[PDB]
Amino acid sequence: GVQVETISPGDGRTFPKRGQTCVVHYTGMLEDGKKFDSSRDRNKPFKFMLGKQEVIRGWEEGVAQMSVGQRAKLTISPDYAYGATGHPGIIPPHATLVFDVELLKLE
Amino acid sequence: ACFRMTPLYNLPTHRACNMFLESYKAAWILTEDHSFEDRMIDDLSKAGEQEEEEEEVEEKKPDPLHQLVLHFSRTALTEKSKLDEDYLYMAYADIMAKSCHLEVEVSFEEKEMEKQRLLYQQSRLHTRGAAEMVLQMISACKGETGAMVSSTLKLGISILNGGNAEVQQKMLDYLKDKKEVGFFQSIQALMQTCSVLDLNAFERQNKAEGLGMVNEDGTVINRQNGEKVMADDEFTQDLFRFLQLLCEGHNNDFQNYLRTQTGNTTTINIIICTVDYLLRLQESISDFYWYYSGKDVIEEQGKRNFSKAMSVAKQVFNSLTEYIQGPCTGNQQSLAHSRLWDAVVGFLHVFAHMMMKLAQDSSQIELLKELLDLQ
Amino acid sequence: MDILELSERLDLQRFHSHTLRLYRAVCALGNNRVAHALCSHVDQAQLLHALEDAHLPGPLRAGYYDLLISIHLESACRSRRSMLSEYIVPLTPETRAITLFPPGRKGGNARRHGLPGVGVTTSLRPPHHFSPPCFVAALPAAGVAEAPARLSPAIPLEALRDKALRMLGEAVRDGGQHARDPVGGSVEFQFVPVLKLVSTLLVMGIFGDEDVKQILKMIEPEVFTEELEEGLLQMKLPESVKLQMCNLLEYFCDQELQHRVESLAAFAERYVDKLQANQRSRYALLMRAFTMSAAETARRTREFRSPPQEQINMLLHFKDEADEEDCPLPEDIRQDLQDFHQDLLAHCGIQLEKKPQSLQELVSHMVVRWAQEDYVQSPELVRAMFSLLHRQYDGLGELLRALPRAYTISPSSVEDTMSLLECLGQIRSLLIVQMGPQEENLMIQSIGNIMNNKVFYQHPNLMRALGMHETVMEVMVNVLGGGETKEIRFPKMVTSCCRFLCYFCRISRQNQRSMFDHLSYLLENSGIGLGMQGSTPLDVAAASVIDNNELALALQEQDLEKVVSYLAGCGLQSCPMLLAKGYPDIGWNPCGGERYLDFLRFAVFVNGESVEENANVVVRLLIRKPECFGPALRGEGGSGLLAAIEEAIRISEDPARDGPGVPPEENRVHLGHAIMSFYAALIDLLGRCAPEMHLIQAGKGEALRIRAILRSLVPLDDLVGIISLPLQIPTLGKDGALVQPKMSASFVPDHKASMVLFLDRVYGIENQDFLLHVLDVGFLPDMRAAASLDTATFSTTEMALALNRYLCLAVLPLITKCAP
Amino acid sequence: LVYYEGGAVCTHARSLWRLEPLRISWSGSHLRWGQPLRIRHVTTGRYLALTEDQGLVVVDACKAHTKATSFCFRVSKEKLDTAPKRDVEGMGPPEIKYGESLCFVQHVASGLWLTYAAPDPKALRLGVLKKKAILHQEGHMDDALFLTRCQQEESQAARMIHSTAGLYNQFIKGLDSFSGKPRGSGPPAGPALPIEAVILSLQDLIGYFEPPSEELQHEEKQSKLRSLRNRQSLFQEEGMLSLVLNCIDRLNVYTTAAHFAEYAGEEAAESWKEIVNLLYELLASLIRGNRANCALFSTNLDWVVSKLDRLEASSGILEVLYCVLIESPEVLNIIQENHIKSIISLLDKHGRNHKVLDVLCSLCVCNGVAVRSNQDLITENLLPGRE
Structure with a gap:
C-alpha cells in the first residue's frame, strides 16, 4: 500500500489539513532507483490541493500524515499507484513507485 | 438600393477600412512601378576583386548571375513527376526577360547602337546558359501549361529577341547533344493545349453579357469575367513567336532540325503540328464567321474576339513564313504534301466573306485593316 | 560514465547521437504525450546545463539542442510559422498610434528607418500555450481519444531567452578570439545550435525587444547603433551557418514588412475617418446646394448613386492628377495622402557612407559578397540567399503579394476572432499528422467551434483570405486518397467536411465561386463519395452550383461526362454493400444514380430556371446511354415505367425482398421506394430539361425537337397511368389508432409530383376533355383523398401535410392554366 | 500466347x-x-x-x-x-x-x-x-x-x-531436388549446384546495380539514377524480385551451414554463408530507391520480419528492411506492435547498433508525416524500461 518513513524530522505540531493546497518539492524514482521526475529539476515546487485527487490518490494520502518541514520516503503500491495500466512511457505497468516529499509550505 | 446605398460616413468603420485598403492597393501601389531589375542584373553580373586570387581564373568561378542560373538549371534538370511552381523562378525569369529586352528619325548609327545594346544584354544572359536551361525547363515541363512554362518561354523570347545567331547556335548544339525527345514531346503537348475559338464558349459569354445579372452586393449590372475565349492566347502567341525566333535568320540547319530530329529516336515535325493547329484555327474562325453571318453586324465584343484571334493567326502565319523562308527545300516539300493548301482555301473564303460583311459599316474599318494585314 | 569521456569513444558517441535523433524522430510532429514521456527521461535542467557546457562534443550538443528546441518549442514553432503569413490588424487606438517612421526632428523620409523588430505590432497572434510537466497527476479516468490532446511541456521562456543571449555573446566573443579549439570541435558546431535557438525564440516572439536590439548589435554593430564587436558577416562563417543566419535576416525582414502593413492600416484608419467627416460635410452641402445648381447636383448625386465601394474607388482617383480636380476631396487632404504615399515609397526604398545603413541594402551586399567570394555548393542555401536578395530588392512587390492577405477587424470582436484563429491553428495542425481517432474527435469539435463562431458568419471575405475552406478540402482529400473505395474510412470525417464546406456554400456566392474552381476534382472524388450517408462530396458539389446562373453556365460538359458515366455505372449493377447488408441484389444501383440525378437537377434549375445548353448536353449523354434511360422504359426488351412502378410497390409489399432479416441506423430503404425514387428523379431531370414556354411560342426548332424526343421517351398515356396510381392513405385502426406505413417503403407524393411536374413542363395542357380525363384518372382520386385528409387527427399527420404540399404546388397551377 | x-x-x-x-x-x-x-x-x-x-x-x-x-x-x-x-x-x-x-x-x-x-x-x-x-x-x-x-x-x-532467370530456375530446381531427401552419410545423388555460377551472377548483378557515387555532378548523376529507375522497373516486371525471394526462402529452410550440408554436403556448405549474405545484398540493391519495388514488400512485411531475427545475414536483412522502410510510406502504415517489438528484440539480442537505431528512426516518421500509432507504440514498448 503506502509506506511512510522520515529522513528529516518535521515540526509535528502543524499538519496538512484536508482541503488546503500544499506546495511541495519531490523527486520521483522507480524502485530500482532510476529517477524519472524531480520537482527540484523543475526548480519550482509542485502545488496540489488536498482532496482534489489531482495527485495519485494513493500518493495524496501519504502526504497527509507527513508533517511540515519533514523530509519523507514514500513507497506506493501499484494499486495505490498508477496500477496495471500504469503510465504510458514514464511508469511501467503494475509497478510500485517511490518518492521523497518535501512539504515546504501550505497556501 | 441607392437609398439603401450607405454613404461612406454611415458605412461601418472596419468594413470601410478594408474596402479602402483594396481601393488604394488598386489605385496607387499597383499602378506605380520602377525598374530596379536592370541594376539588379547589373550587380548580379559584375565581378569584383576575384583577380587578386589568380587561381580562380583557371577554374572560372561563376559570377553571381551565373550561380543563380546554375542553381535554376539544377532545379530544372532534377527529375520530378510534376513541374512544381516556384514563385522565385517565376519572378527571377520575369526579371531577366525584362532586363534583357529593356524596352522616330533614328539614324543608322542610332538604330545599330540599339541593336548592339540588345546584343550585349542578350550576351550577358546567354553566357550563363539561360536558354539552355529554358529548353531544360520545357523538357521537365513535359507539355503542361502553366505560369512556369509561360514565363520561361517569355524569357526565351527575350533572349532570342532580334534572332541572335549565337543563341540559335548554342540551343541547336544543346538540342543535338541531348538528342532527347521529351522536349519536342512537351512542345507537341503544348500546342495541343493551345486553344481555338469555341462557339459554345462565345454563346456562354453572350449569355453572360445579355443577362448582366445584378451582383447581390447593391446593384452591379453588366459584370464581365475574364474572357474564357482565348484565355491562353497570349501564351500561344509567346510559343509561336518562340518557334519564330528559333527559326529566325533563315538558318537552314535549324529549319532542318525542326523538320526532322535525326538524333532523336522518335522524330516529330513541329511544322506540320503548326499546320494542324492552323487548321483548328480556321475551323474556329469559320464557325464564328457563320455565327456572325447570321447576324446583320458583328457586336463590339465579338470584334475584339476576332481581333485577338487574328492577331494570333498573324503570329502563326509569320512563324510559318519564317519556317519556309531561307528557303529550306525540305520545308518546301513538307508544306507541299501537307494540307496548308486547304488551309489557305478556307482562310480565303473566310477573308472574302468578312470583307463583304465589314465593308458596309464605318465602325468595322479598324478590324478590316487588321484583316488586310492578316491577308 | 562521464559524457565528456564519451567524446573519445566514437562508437558510444555515434550511438548516443543516434539515440538523441531517435528521441527527436519519435517526438516529431508535435507528439505531445511522447514529448512529456521524454521529459520523464530527459531533464529540462539537464538540457540547459548541456547547452551551457562547451567541452561536450559537437554532435552531442547538436542533438541536445535539437531535442530542447523540438520537444518543447516545435509545436508552437510550426503553429506560429503557419499563422505568420496571415496579416490581420485590429482597429485599436494603439494601432492608430503606429506610424511608418519614428517621430523626430528630421523629416520622416530623411529620418533613419526604424530599428527593425522594435516597436508595437498589433497583428493578432494567439498566445503560446504550454502545460507544466507533472507526473504525480492522477491518471485520466476519461477514455483515450476523448480527452483533449496534451499541451507541449512548459519551459521558463524568459530564462531561456537570457541564456540564449548569453551563449550568443560568448560565440561572438570566441569568434573574435579565433581560438584554435572551437566550441564543440568546429566553428559550425559551435554556432549552429545558437542560431537555431535564436531563430525559434525570435519567431515565437518571446524574445524581448531590448534583447532583439542586442541581437541586431551582434549581427551588425555599426549598422544598428541608435543615436570591438565585429559583425557576424565580417566574421565569415561556413555555409550552414550562413544558411541559418540568413534565416534570421529573413525573419527580421518579415517582421519589417508586417510593420509596413500595420502602418498602412493605421494610415487607412486616419484617412477613412477623414473621409467620413468630409463626405458627411459634402452630403450636408448637397442637401443645401441642391437648390442652386442641378447639373452639378445631378453628377454629385450620381456619385452618391454609386455603390459605396465604387465611391471609395473614384474618390481614390487623385493619383494621376489628370482628374484630381474632379475628385470632391479637397487639395489639403489630397496633399497629406500624397505625403503618406511618398513616406511609404521612402520606407520601401522605392523612391530615390559605404556601409548601407539599411537592412535591405546590407543583406543585398552580403549576398553579393558571398557569391563573389565563392560559388555556393548547397542548393538550399543558394535558394535561400537568392530569395532573400530578390525580396530585399522588391519591397513594393512584397506589399503587392501581402495586401490581399491583409485584413482589418473591428476591436469589439477581437477576442472571438482570436478564438477562430486558434481553431484554424488546430485545423492546420492536423494536416501534417496521419489521421487517427483522437484527431477525428479533434477536428470534428474544432469544425463545430468554427460554425459556432459569429465572426465566422460576419466577414466572408476574411475567411476567404484565411483559407480554412482550402485547408478543409485538403484534409478531405488526404482522408479520401487512401482506399476510399474499399473502405470509406471515417464517414464522420467525410460528413463533417461536408457540413463545413456545405455551410460555406450556404454562406456566400463569392465563396460559391471559390469552391467552384475545384468542382471538377471534387466531383472526381465524389464519384464514390455519394455512397456515403446523407450528405456527401457530391452534395457539396451540388450546393456549389445552385443559386448562380453564371456558375451554371460555367458548368463543364466533361464534368457532365463524368457524372453521366457515373450514373450509367450505377445502372450497371447494384451497390456491393447492399449484399454486404444482406440486402438482396438488383441489376443496378438506384440510390447513387438518384444522388447524381439530384445533383444534375440542382445544376439545371437555378432559381427554378433551366439552362438550355446544359439540358441539351444531358440529352446527348442520355441518348448515348440507354442505361441512363434505365431498366424501365428500356425500349427493346423494355419494361414499362408503369409496370416497373407496380413491381416496385409489390417489392415494397414483399417482406425481406428489401431486407436481410437475420435497424440501428434505420437508413436502410425498401428497394422499391429507392428505384422509384431514382425514376422520379429521372423524370424530374427530364421535365426540367424541357424547353420553356418562351422560345416554344416562337418555337426554336431544336427546342421542339428535344421536346418531341422527351414526349417520345415518356408516353403521355404512361404518365396518365402513373398519376392514376392510387396512394395508400394512413387510416385509423386496431381500436382506431392510425396506421402509417414507413416512408422508406411507401410510394410517395413527392414522386407523384415529379410525374405531374414533368407533365406540365413537357406535355402541358391541350384539351379540356383531356384535362378532365387526366383529373379523373389521377387528380380526382387524389382530391377525394384530400377531402378525406381534412380531419383533426389527419391534420396532425405529416404525410397528409405532404399531400397538401405537393397537390398545391402542382394541382393548383394546373387549375390556374386549365381554368379557361 | x-x-x-x-x-x-x-x-x-x-x-x-x-x-x-x-x-x-x-x-x-x-x-x-x-x-x-x-x-x-x-x-x-x-x-x-x-x-x-x-x-x-x-x-x-x-x-x-x-x-x-x-x-x-x-x-x-x-x-x-x-x-x-x-x-x-x-x-x-x-x-x-x-x-x-x-x-x-x-x-x-x-x-x-x-x-x-x-x-x-x-x-x-x-x-x-x-x-x-x-x-x-x-x-x-x-x-x-x-x-x-x-x-x-x-x-x-x-x-x-x-x-x-534460366540459371536461377535450374538452381532452384536443384534445391528442390535435394530438399526432399536428407542426404545423410551418402552422396548427394543430385547434379552439382551451380555454386560458383550463382556467386558470379550475384557479383555481376551488384556491380551492375551499384548506385552512382555522389561525387559525380548533378546532371549525369540524375541521368544515371534515371537509368537505375528504368533498370529496377525492368527487373520488377521480369519477376526477378519474386524468384530471388523464392531462392531466399528455399535456402532459409536450412538453418545452419552444417545443417544444410547434411542435405547437400560440405562442398556445398562452405559457400552457403556467403551465398545467403550476397543474396540479401542483391535484394537490397534491387529494391533500393524504387517505389514499385517497395510496393510488393508491403504485401508481406511479416515475411521480412521473421527473417530479421535470423542470424547468418543479420546485417543484410537489416539493410533490406532499411531500404524498404525509408522509401515507402504504406509499409510504415501497415506495421504492427508485434513487428515493432520484434525489432526491439533484435536490438536486444544483437546489442547496440546505430544502424538498427536509424531504421527505427525511419519507422517513426516518413514522407514528412509521422504515424501517431507507430510513435506511441514504440514509446510505450521501448522507452519505459530504459535498459
Missing part, C-alpha cells in the same frame, strides 16, 4: 522482341523485303512459330522446326511471291527503315496473314487491352506492322535477365 497489348507493357521488356535472319553469314546486313526471318522473344528466349493445335504461339528453340518457325516481313498485303531475291553478301541494299517503314508480317510456310483476333465479346467486361494474335487468310486492314528502335542497354539488360 502473344496478344496485342498497349500500355506500360510497351515500355516494358516483354514487349521487346528479338529478330534474326535465317542465313548465318551477314546476319547483320540490311533487312530485305520479304526476307526469311526467325523471331525469338528476347526475355523468354523462345521462338515464335506456328503449331497446328495452337495456331501460332511462342515456342522453345529446341521445339522450333525453323520452317514453321520461319516468317517473312512484307511491305505489301497483296502477294505475288513469284521470284525469290538473290542472296547477297556484304551490307546489302537497305530495304526497310528503322522506325519509319510500315510492314506486313507473313509466315513463309503458311502464307497466312498475322492479324488480331478482333475484340471478343464479353472481353470488354474484363477490360483487357490485349487481343490474341491470329493467322488469317484475309487478315485485316491493320495488318501493316509499324516498327520501332530498341535501346542498347535495355536489350543488354533483357538478355542478362533471361540468362539469370
